[PDB]
């Protein structure tokens, strides 16, 4: 129901090929930072001070908090849920805005 934070799950170990590509690990948990052509994703691991990076969609799945299954949904639908801005629209926001604070709710 509530949105504002989207995440994905690595079902396969990705291998950074590009010069800005990032490597991943199979059966891993991570969150998308952006999406390109609803084909590529802007990964951003914390395990290491770096990222973000480009990752394949076939190597990541979107699912809600649970054991780890596929309901049959898609990332695109989740992209419009978390207003997941395209890597192109993100890069545009980068160096555009400045660290700020926004209203936040509260509920145990």
UniProtKB/Swiss-Prot annotation:
Span of the signal peptide: none
SH3 domain span: 4-65
Cell compartment(s), UniProt: Cytoplasm, Cytoskeleton
Residues with the Phosphoserine modification: 103, 106
Top-level taxonomic group: Eukaryota
Anything else known: Present with 6490 molecules/cell in log phase SD medium.
Assembly information from the UniProt record: Interacts with AXL2 and BUD5.
Function summary: Necessary for cell polarization during vegetative growth. May link the cytoskeleton to morphogenic determinants on the cell surface.
Descriptive protein name: Bud emergence protein 1
Source organism: Saccharomyces cerevisiae (strain ATCC 204508 / S288c)
Gene designation per UniProt: BEM1
């Amino acid at each position: 129901g509530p949105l504002g934070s989207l995440y994905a799950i690595v079902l396969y170990d990705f291998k950074a090929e590009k010069a800005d590509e990032l490597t991943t690990y199979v059966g891993e948990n991570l969150f998308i930072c952006a999406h390109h052509n609803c084909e590529w994703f802007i990964a951003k691991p914390i395990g290491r001070l770096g990222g973000p990076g480009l990752v394949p969609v076939g190597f990541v799945s979107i699912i809600d908090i649970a054991t780890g299954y596929a309901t049959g949904n898609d990332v695109i639908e989740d992209i419009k849920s978390v207003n997941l801005p395209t890597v192109q629209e993100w890069k545009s926001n980068i160096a555009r805005y400045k660290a700020s604070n926004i209203s936040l709710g509260s509920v145990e």
